[PDB]
Every structure is written in structure tokens, then in C-alpha cells.
Scaffold this active site. Structure first.
Site, mmCIF file in Angstrom:
data_model
loop_
_atom_site.group_PDB
_atom_site.id
_atom_site.type_symbol
_atom_site.label_atom_id
_atom_site.label_comp_id
_atom_site.label_asym_id
_atom_site.label_seq_id
_atom_site.Cartn_x
_atom_site.Cartn_y
_atom_site.Cartn_z
ATOM 1 N N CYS A 217 0.841 -1.209 0.000
ATOM 2 C CA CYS A 217 0.000 0.000 0.000
ATOM 3 C C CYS A 217 0.861 1.238 0.000
ATOM 4 C CB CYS A 217 -0.949 0.030 1.213
ATOM 5 S SG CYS A 217 -1.953 1.571 1.403
ATOM 6 N N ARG B 99 0.130 4.532 2.856
ATOM 7 C CA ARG B 99 0.147 4.313 4.302
ATOM 8 C C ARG B 99 0.610 5.509 5.118
ATOM 9 N NH1 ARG B 99 3.939 -0.688 4.665
ATOM 10 N NH2 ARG B 99 4.261 -0.259 2.437
ATOM 11 N N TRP C 181 -9.126 6.789 -0.592
ATOM 12 C CA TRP C 181 -9.415 7.496 -1.818
ATOM 13 C C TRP C 181 -8.477 7.036 -2.943
ATOM 14 C CZ3 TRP C 181 -8.071 10.237 2.724
ATOM 15 C CH2 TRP C 181 -6.725 10.605 2.817
ATOM 16 N N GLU D 34 -5.003 3.974 -10.609
ATOM 17 C CA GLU D 34 -5.861 2.819 -10.375
ATOM 18 C C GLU D 34 -7.027 2.803 -11.358
ATOM 19 O OE1 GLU D 34 -6.325 1.651 -6.089
ATOM 20 O OE2 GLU D 34 -5.944 3.794 -5.771
HETATM 21 C C1 HEM Z 1 -6.162 6.826 1.624
HETATM 22 C C2 HEM Z 1 -5.596 6.680 0.422
HETATM 23 C C3 HEM Z 1 -5.054 5.324 -0.098
HETATM 24 C C4 HEM Z 1 -4.456 5.169 -1.282
HETATM 25 C C5 HEM Z 1 -4.192 6.286 -2.326
HETATM 26 C C6 HEM Z 1 -4.087 3.774 -1.421
HETATM 27 C C7 HEM Z 1 -3.444 3.227 -2.514
HETATM 28 C C8 HEM Z 1 -3.222 1.883 -2.721
HETATM 29 C C9 HEM Z 1 -2.940 1.230 -3.984
HETATM 30 C C10 HEM Z 1 -2.831 1.922 -5.361
HETATM 31 C C11 HEM Z 1 -2.780 -0.073 -3.745
HETATM 32 C C12 HEM Z 1 -2.469 -1.127 -4.821
HETATM 33 C C13 HEM Z 1 -3.810 -1.622 -5.344
HETATM 34 C C14 HEM Z 1 -3.729 -1.866 -6.820
HETATM 35 O O1 HEM Z 1 -3.074 -1.044 -7.503
HETATM 36 O O2 HEM Z 1 -4.332 -2.854 -7.312
HETATM 37 C C15 HEM Z 1 -2.956 -0.312 -2.320
HETATM 38 C C16 HEM Z 1 -2.879 -1.514 -1.639
HETATM 39 C C17 HEM Z 1 -3.363 -1.792 -0.366
HETATM 40 N N1 HEM Z 1 -3.936 -0.893 0.540
HETATM 41 FE FE1 HEM Z 1 -3.953 1.150 0.281
HETATM 42 N N2 HEM Z 1 -4.492 3.097 -0.276
HETATM 43 C C18 HEM Z 1 -5.094 4.020 0.567
HETATM 44 C C19 HEM Z 1 -5.637 3.727 1.807
HETATM 45 C C20 HEM Z 1 -5.728 2.493 2.420
HETATM 46 C C21 HEM Z 1 -6.565 2.147 3.558
HETATM 47 C C22 HEM Z 1 -7.519 3.143 4.255
HETATM 48 C C23 HEM Z 1 -6.367 0.847 3.832
HETATM 49 C C24 HEM Z 1 -6.972 -0.030 4.954
HETATM 50 C C25 HEM Z 1 -7.499 0.477 6.075
HETATM 51 C C26 HEM Z 1 -5.386 0.342 2.886
HETATM 52 C C27 HEM Z 1 -4.895 -0.941 2.832
HETATM 53 C C28 HEM Z 1 -4.303 -1.529 1.734
HETATM 54 C C29 HEM Z 1 -3.972 -2.925 1.650
HETATM 55 C C30 HEM Z 1 -4.177 -4.040 2.706
HETATM 56 C C31 HEM Z 1 -3.343 -3.089 0.273
HETATM 57 C C32 HEM Z 1 -2.809 -4.418 -0.278
HETATM 58 C C33 HEM Z 1 -3.767 -4.790 -1.382
HETATM 59 C C34 HEM Z 1 -3.550 -6.226 -1.724
HETATM 60 O O3 HEM Z 1 -2.774 -6.902 -0.995
HETATM 61 O O4 HEM Z 1 -4.144 -6.710 -2.723
HETATM 62 N N3 HEM Z 1 -5.028 1.365 2.052
HETATM 63 N N4 HEM Z 1 -3.208 0.912 -1.742
HETATM 64 C C1 LIG Z 2 -7.855 0.901 0.674
HETATM 65 C C2 LIG Z 2 -7.513 1.095 -0.774
HETATM 66 C C3 LIG Z 2 -7.459 2.367 -1.330
HETATM 67 C C4 LIG Z 2 -7.147 2.507 -2.682
HETATM 68 N N1 LIG Z 2 -7.082 3.736 -3.252
HETATM 69 N N2 LIG Z 2 -6.912 1.412 -3.435
HETATM 70 C C5 LIG Z 2 -6.962 0.165 -2.910
HETATM 71 C C6 LIG Z 2 -6.712 -0.947 -3.712
HETATM 72 C C7 LIG Z 2 -6.742 -2.228 -3.170
HETATM 73 C C8 LIG Z 2 -6.535 -3.410 -4.047
HETATM 74 C C9 LIG Z 2 -5.461 -4.279 -4.004
HETATM 75 N N3 LIG Z 2 -5.386 -5.326 -4.844
HETATM 76 C C10 LIG Z 2 -6.340 -5.576 -5.751
HETATM 77 C C11 LIG Z 2 -7.446 -4.738 -5.836
HETATM 78 C C12 LIG Z 2 -8.544 -5.002 -6.845
HETATM 79 N N4 LIG Z 2 -9.856 -4.675 -6.244
HETATM 80 C C13 LIG Z 2 -7.541 -3.656 -4.972
HETATM 81 C C14 LIG Z 2 -7.048 -2.396 -1.826
HETATM 82 C C15 LIG Z 2 -7.312 -1.290 -1.021
HETATM 83 C C16 LIG Z 2 -7.263 -0.012 -1.567
#
Ligand code: HEM
Ligand SMILES: Cc1cc(N)nc2cc(-c3cncc(CN)c3)ccc12
Ligand code: HEM
Ligand SMILES: Cc1cc(N)nc2cc(-c3cncc(CN)c3)ccc12
Ligand SMILES: C[C@H](O)[C@H](O)[C@H]1CNc2nc(N)[nH]c(=O)c2N1
Ligand SMILES: C[C@H](O)[C@H](O)[C@H]1CNc2nc(N)[nH]c(=O)c2N1
Ligand SMILES: [Zn+2]
Lengths: 409, 411
Positions: free
Chosen positions: B108, B111, B280, B285
Site C-alpha cells: 500500500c 500508508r 481514496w 488505479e
Molecule cells: C487513503 C488513500 C489510499 C491510497 C491512495 C491507497 C493506494 C493503494 C494502492 C494503489 C494499492 C495497490 C492496489 C492496486 O493497484 O491494485 C494499495 C494496496 C493496499 N492498501 Fe492502500 N491506499 C489508501 C488507503 C488504504 C486504507 C484506508 C487501507 C486499509 C485500512 C489500505 C490498505 C491496503 C492494503 C491491505 C493493500 C494491499 C492490497 C492487496 O494486498 O491486494 N489502504 N493501496
Molecule cells: C484501501 C484502498 C485504497 C485505494 N485507493 N486502493 C486500494 C486498492 C486495493 C486493491 C489491491 N489489490 C487488488 C485490488 C482489486 N480490487 C484492490 C485495496 C485497497 C485499496
């Protein structure tokens, strides 16, 4: 332990058995993945099993595993090691070794061409002057009037570590870099320390933005020697844009021949510390990395200015916009000048084919996702959605410390 | 044992000691790296160790390690486990747990915001209807008229594994996808299978290219039920381009609230199988993946065509050119509508700063380079040049299989 890899864009699944034949380590453990780390004098008993593994591979590939020819060779090498504390590769083995080092180079996206490699055996070389000659012939052969051909030239193997052959340049052809009075940097910042080493060793610099560096050649462990590559051998391409006429006034050019010269080729336990090899460029290596990296030519802002993009906020994506046009221009210039170049879409598609083939004929293909995925437009290239397994096979190309940190004068 | 990571654009070098506190595995061995592989009943026998280590963690963070409160809480959890085969988290503990789960989420990039998480305790929920109500409130609170806020809603923990709470949607808000008989896909190809389930479960499908999917909600191991998110709660943005007037005529929109609902929250040994969380969007994405992935809306060609690009030779980089303009348009549309979004340049920069801060106050920051680096313009963002260590800390968000592949239907 018969691993599957999946393509998430096509649902293609491949089974990897080849990783089972892995020798060396990765720097990864069960508790930590180091897959993004850039960089993680043999004895007699160390060398024979290394020699055996390689000869076993070799005679297997020529469909002669377990044959008299195989056994006799194994015996012959075995004798030579006990006696000479090393051994010599047969021409055919040398060629196999080189071709397979490339094949195993998990960070290389161009490996579909791996079997069409031209090996130049320079093991009879004794002086830097002699090295210069082999190197000029490499450069001329590989360039080939723009119709690039892949080649490697192999200098004598390490012996005792005090008689090493080294090319001190990181690539055969690179532009110089000088630190300016006002603190800035003229030419190529990545080459500043080496550029100053040449000067600090007798080079007279033209102090331009694109001065071809001289060769610093170290034979048999002696002090290295300076040589200028005849400019008639250095094929260069002026950089213009097919739609932006102002583009030419930026005054950019690049060399046609990517030729890496600071790595170590390891075959059957033998160490070739000087083995410059070359192919042809993927467009992004120049356009994205060489030109736009902050620690390099860093022309983005300057180019964006000519396009009159909105450079006030980052969310205008002006950097991305400029990035694209620059890479459009590099491809366009090379292609116009009939110099070989591949775009990142073509090459990644090639590599996907190559993967299929290696799983189908070899049972696997080591690959480093972090390096195979192009530095721009990653996820619209097929490799991005391709799971890859990275493991270390031999023969191999390995990194080695820059000579100036090791050498004694 | 120390470990150093280097940034090759700045020559900054950091020392990781946090990786030592790593419990879980990576999937890598000395002989293989699996860092690019997408996916690499729990009795009391193993539960109290997992509990103790979490409680030790918690009371250290609040500077009460070895205190009376720490010891007595340990004893309390102990007896409750041997007595009831499980235990309950206090509110404080659960809040700490959600926060640190996010903080430990190595894939992520966002964070930097981990400390500001709104934690909704829905552990008293007992029915699908109660789930629907909690989720509506999450969506309303998180959306906040376009000024987005991070939130997570935590439903009851797994018990015997036969009474799981699950949100069958992968995201709370997501568009339907319908396989047509001619092979083409209407809507989001990603969501076709889940759409079919919904349809089977009685969902009257509008069959359009941007239909918000019904919530499919499972409470206490019961069969899942359909609920429609009230439209006024679903904030969407029409996609237009700032220079290209024909762009709006492509008829594209997207929702503002990314709310992932299919992952599993693990805290102190407890497993929360339904824990929707939202933040957000990073612009890429939507613009790179949702729209331009060949296995998604895949509008690159229709955009490229309208731009009149040379599409006959891929070395014209027309794919690259089309991609930038689409991402430009996504960002422009959201900003113009005052809906929170972040561009991949701002986000990666923020994450580098975060990461450095985490090495200085925590002793490390687990990070998956492969996922952190943006899917366009990678090397001109600073995370590309940043070496990163990937290891697994707890509390953590984990993946789980799709519920429809493991669910015992009642009828
Ligand atoms: C607030 C703005 C946030 C942004 C811009 C953001 C952005 C991202 C992005 C771009 C990914 C990769 C997902 C993808 O590209 O498919 C990711 C992964 C992830 N995010 Fe964030 N995120 C945010 C907030 C959060 C929040 C609030 C949580 C949980 C409370 C979180 C937990 C996670 C987790 C657990 C992953 C791993 C996804 C996976 O393992 O498939 N994130 N984040
Ligand atoms: C909290 C949060 C925020 C954000 N902007 N993107 C996320 C994207 C993912 C994410 C990770 N792997 C695969 C996917 C496909 N749905 C999504 C999980 C959480 C997210
Ligand atoms: C013929 C066309 C070729 C293309 C298009 C190509 C492309 C590439 C690219 C893009 C990289 C990434 C490194 C970087 O971004 O700086 C790379 C790495 C590499 N290439 Fe290839 N290459 C070609 C030929 C060859 C040949 C002929 C050899 C050896 C005989 C070779 C061996 C390697 C090795 C060993 C690496 C990684 C070295 C390291 O560990 O850093 N390549 N190549
Ligand atoms: C044969 C060849 C062709 C090509 N187009 N690029 C290469 C790039 C490298 C390479 C690998 N690691 C680090 C660098 C830094 N200059 C370069 C090596 C060989 C290459
Ligand atoms: C730290 C990171 O591993 C480093 O920047 C790598 C990433 N991927 C790369 N990929 C290629 N092809 N070439 C590179 O030089 C790098 N650099
Ligand atoms: C196979 C590969 O791991 C897969 O395509 C990954 C690569 N990196 C990613 N990075 C992000 N942010 N999101 C993704 O979905 C993926 N997919
Ligand atoms: Zn690894």
C-alpha cells in the site's frame, strides 16, 4: 516444488521445473524478500564439481550425456585441475557457456535472441593494446553499419586475482561527465567519477555535453591504459521528433551500441573478468532512463517547457506527457537512421513468447519482474501481468567491484 | 542483524531492524524469489501465543509494558481463551489493530495516512440487514460529499469457521459486467462472475456499462442476501478531458470511493473475515488499470482512434500517448468535481517521506516494490529508485478465497 506461474491478463499457466536445477542463492529468505535490492580466488576442490556440473550440462545438450566423449572430457578436465589448479575451456564449450550465460540472465528482456550470439575468443590476448584491437573489432562487427548484431568478446580468465583482465569502463561507449563550477553537471552525471579518473590519468577532455569517453584497459593485472575508439567506429544518432520541429535544437544524440563491459562471465567455475558484450537498445533505456532520470541528463523540465505544458501542478501529468514524446523521438530517430532499436511493447511481447518457449522446451525461465517490466507504461505491457520466478542458474553474468577500488598500482 | 536499503537517485541509505520482528513467511527461499507472484478453524493451541504477542505490542505502543493493566489483561485473555476457545478485543485494542494492519500493508503506497483511520466497530451485528446498515453508514461517512475520509468497518470475528461474516463483493462499490453471447463484454469484465451470481440470486440487472452492483452480504454463516446501495449515497464522476471535448462523448464515469471488502483482518490471532475499508483513489488505479487493462474497459483504441494516432505501428507509442491523456482526464474530472484523488507523482513522493519516517521511528517499513511502483511512468517517480524490504508483520490484512468457492449453502 514444481511451481506454477500465471498470466493474469490471459489466464496462461506455466509449470516451472527448471528452478530445481538452481545452484546459487537469491538473497531472499522465508522471512524477507529482497527481490528489489540492486546488488546483493577459487580453490582446487571448489573448481572440479563446478567443472563437472557444466560439462554434464554441455554433453547433455549435444545429446551425448554418459558417452565415451563425455567421460573422457570429464577425466581430462579432472586431470588438468589436479595438476594446473585450473583448466581451459574447449572452443565449443566456451561458446555454449557464453550463450547460456545470456539465456540465464533473469534481468534481461532480450533473451529471445540468446542463441544467435557471436562469440569472440580473445583468450590469447596479452596486452592492453591487444585488448584495444579486439575491442575495436567487436564494436565494428556489432555495429555493422546500423544493422546491429549481438556479440561478446572474452578475454583470458582469472588466474590468481593479481593477473586479472579488466575493462574499467562500464560500457564500451559512454558520454563523459564533468562537474561544473556553479555546482551543476555537464554531459553525463553517471560517469563523473570515471570521467575524472581518465582525466586524472592523462585524458584530454573536449568538455562537451556528449564527449565519447576513452577506453581504460587493464591487461594481466597491470596499470590500465587509455585508448580512443576511432570515431568512425562510434555510430551515433541525432535526436529529432517526427512532429515537433523544435526538438532538434535541444541538441541531443545517443550512441547506437549498448555494450556492457564491467561484468564477470562465470563458466564451469572459471571467471572471465573482462568480457564486454553488446546487443541493441530498447527505446526506454535511452528515452526514459538516460534522458529523464534526475541523476542523469534530466531534460524533462526543459522539454516540457518547449511543449508549453502546465508545469504548475504535478496532476497535469506534464512529466508523463513529455516522457512519451521524448521516447517517441528516440525510436523515430534510430529508425530513420536505420539503426537497430526495439520499442518496449515489441520487446516485452518478444520476451513473453520467449517465456512460453523456455517453459515448453527447457521447463522454465528465470526472470526478475522488477527489471523486466519497462520503466514507463508498465501495466500496458504484457510482462506486467506475468508472474515470474527469479532464481540463479549457471553459467552466468555477475557483477564485480569497480577496478579502482581494488587495483594496486 | 542489520539490513541496509539504498535509494539510487539520492544515495540515502537506511537500516532495517524491524524485519527481525517478522513472524510470517514471504514465499521466497534462498533458491527462489516469488516476489512477483500475486497470491503467495484455529484452535487455542496456537491462539494465546498470537494473543500475547499482540498485547505485548499494544501495551508497548501505549507505554504500559509490564504494567498492572498489561499483566491483568494477559491473564484475562488467557482464562477467556481456555474457557471459550477464543477472546474479545477491547475497543482500544481493535482500533490499534486496524491501524497497524494498514501500517503493515506492504503493498500500500498510501500508508502515510495510517494513523488517521476511522474505525467502525460492527461486532454486534447479527444479520445481513444489520450489515447493510453498517455499510451504508460507512459509505456515507467515508464519502463525505466528496471530501473523502479513511474508514474501516469491522464485523464479527470467525469462530468455528462455520458462522463467518463475509461481504461477497470485492469492493463495496463496483460496476457490473455482462458476458454477451457474441463474446463481447458489457461493463466491467472484472466483475462478470460476481454479476452472474447476483443475477442468479435475484438481482434485476439493468444491463448497462456502468451499473452499480448490489451488495451481497453474508452474516453468521448464513446464505448471502441482496441489498441495493441507495444511489444518493453512491458518488460518481463523469469523465471529461480538459482539452478534448469529444472525451465526454465516450460516456465514461467512475465512482469516487474505493472500498475493498474481500480481505481478512488478522489481529492477535483473531480473524475478521468481513472488514470493508476505504480511502481514496490514486489516479492510475482508474485511468491505467480500470480503463486501459486489456482485461477491463480497454478504451485505449477508441481513445487512440479519436486522437487520430498512428495505430498501425506500436513504435509510434500511441498506446502510451492515449494512456497519459486518459489519466489526465481522470485527474481533471475528480479535481473539478472536488472529489478527493491523488496523482501517482504526489502519492509516491508522499510514500518515500513516510517510508523514511518509518525507518527512523519504527526501524523499518515493509514494502512490496512490485506493487508500490505505479503502473505508468515508473522510473520518473521516486519509489522506482528506492530499494525496499518485504516482510510480513501482524496485525495484517490477508487475502481469502472467494466465498462462493467455499460456502456451504443452506437453501
Ligand atoms: C487513503 C488513500 C489510499 C491510497 C491512495 C491507497 C493506494 C493503494 C494502492 C494503489 C494499492 C495497490 C492496489 C492496486 O493497484 O491494485 C494499495 C494496496 C493496499 N492498501 Fe492502500 N491506499 C489508501 C488507503 C488504504 C486504507 C484506508 C487501507 C486499509 C485500512 C489500505 C490498505 C491496503 C492494503 C491491505 C493493500 C494491499 C492490497 C492487496 O494486498 O491486494 N489502504 N493501496
Ligand atoms: C484501501 C484502498 C485504497 C485505494 N485507493 N486502493 C486500494 C486498492 C486495493 C486493491 C489491491 N489489490 C487488488 C485490488 C482489486 N480490487 C484492490 C485495496 C485497497 C485499496
Ligand atoms: C539484443 C538485444 C538486447 C536487448 C534489447 C536487451 C535488453 C536489456 C535490458 C532493457 C536490460 C535491463 C538493464 C537496464 O535497464 O539497464 C538488460 C539487462 C541485461 N542484459 Fe540484455 N539485452 C539485449 C542483449 C543482451 C546480450 C547480447 C547480453 C549478453 C551477451 C545481455 C545480457 C544482459 C544482462 C547480463 C543484463 C542484466 C545485468 C545485470 O545483472 O544488471 N543482453 N538487457
Ligand atoms: C547487452 C545489453 C543490451 C541492452 N539494450 N541493454 C543492456 C543493459 C545492461 C545493464 C545491466 N545492468 C546495469 C546496467 C547499467 N548500465 C546496464 C546490460 C546489457 C545490455
Ligand atoms: C531499486 C530498484 O531495484 C532499481 O531502481 C532498479 C529497478 N528496476 C530496474 N529495471 C531496469 N530494467 N533497469 C534498472 O536499472 C532498474 N533499476
Ligand atoms: C503478476 C504481477 O505480480 C501482477 O500483475 C501485479 C504486479 N504489480 C501490481 N501492482 C499494483 N499496484 N496492482 C496490481 O494489481 C499489480 N499486479
Ligand atoms: Zn524474494
Amino acid at each position: 516444488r514444481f511451481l506454477k506461474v500465471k498470466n493474469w491478463e490471459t489466464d496462461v499457466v506455466l509449470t516451472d521445473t527448471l528452478h530445481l536445477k538452481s545452484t546459487l542463492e537469491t538473497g531472499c529468505t522465508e522471512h524477507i524478500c529482497m527481490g528489489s535490492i540492486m546488488l546483493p580466488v577459487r580453490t582446487k576442490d571448489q573448481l572440479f564439481p563446478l567443472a563437472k556440473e557444466f560439462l554434464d550440462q554441455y554433453y547433455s545438450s549435444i545429446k551425448r550425456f554418459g558417452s565415451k566423449a563425455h567421460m573422457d572430457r570429464l577425466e581430462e578436465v579432472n586431470k588438468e585441475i589436479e595438476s594446473t589448479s585450473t583448466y581451459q575451456l574447449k572452443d565449443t564449450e566456451l561458446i555454449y557457456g557464453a550463450k547460456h550465460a545470456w539465456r540465464n540472465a533473469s534481468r534481461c528482456v532480450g533473451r529471445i535472441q540468446w542463441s544467435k550470439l557471436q562469440v569472440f575468443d580473445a583468450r590469447d590476448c596479452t596486452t592492453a593494446h591487444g585488448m584495444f584491437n579486439y575491442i575495436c573489432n567487436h564494436v565494428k562487427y556489432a555495429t555493422n553499419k546500423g544493422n546491429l548484431r549481438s556479440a561478446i568478446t572474452i578475454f583470458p580468465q582469472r588466474t590468481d586475482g593479481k593477473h586479472d583482465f579488466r575493462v574499467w569502463n562500464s560500457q564500451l561507449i559512454r558520454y563523459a561527465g564533468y562537474k561544473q563550477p556553479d555546482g551543476s553537471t555537464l554531459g553525463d552525471p553517471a560517469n563523473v567519477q570515471f570521467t575524472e579518473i581518465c582525466i586524472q590519468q592523462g585524458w584530454k577532455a573536449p568538455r562537451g555535453r556528449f564527449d565519447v569517453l576513452p577506453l581504460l584497459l587493464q591487461a594481466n593485472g597491470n596499470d590500465p591504459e587509455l585508448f580512443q575508439i576511432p570515431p568512425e567506429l562510434v555510430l551515433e544518432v541525432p535526436i529529432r521528433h517526427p512532429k515537433f520541429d523544435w526538438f532538434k535544437d535541444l541538441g541531443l544524440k545517443w550512441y547506437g551500441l549498448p555494450a556492457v563491459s564491467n561484468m564477470l562471465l562465470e563458466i564451469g567455475g572459471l571467471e572471465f573478468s573482462a568480457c564486454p558484450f553488446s546487443g541493441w537498445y530498447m527505446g526506454t533505456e535511452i528515452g526514459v532512463r538516460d534522458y529523464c532520470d534526475n541523476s542523469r541528463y534530466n531534460i524533462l523540465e526543459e522539454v516540457a517547457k518547449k511543449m508549453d505544458l502546465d508545469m504548475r501542478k504535478t496532476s497535469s501529468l506534464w512529466k508523463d506527457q513529455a516522457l512519451v514524446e521524448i521516447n517517441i523521438a528516440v525510436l523515430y530517430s534510430f529508425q530513420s537512421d536505420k539503426v537497430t532499436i526495439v520499442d518496449h511493447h515489441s520487446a516485452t511481447e518478444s520476451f513473453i513468447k520467449h517465456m512460453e518457449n523456455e517453459y515448453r522446451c527447457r521447463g522454465g525461465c528465470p526472470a526478475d519482474w522488477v527489471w523486466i517490466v519497462p520503466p514507463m507504461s508498465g501495466s500496458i505491457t504484457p510482462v506486467f501481468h506475468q508472474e515470474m520466478l527469479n532464481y540463479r542458474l549457471t553459467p552466468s553474468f555477475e557483477y564485480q567491484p569497480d577496478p579502482w577500488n581494488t587495483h594496486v598500482w
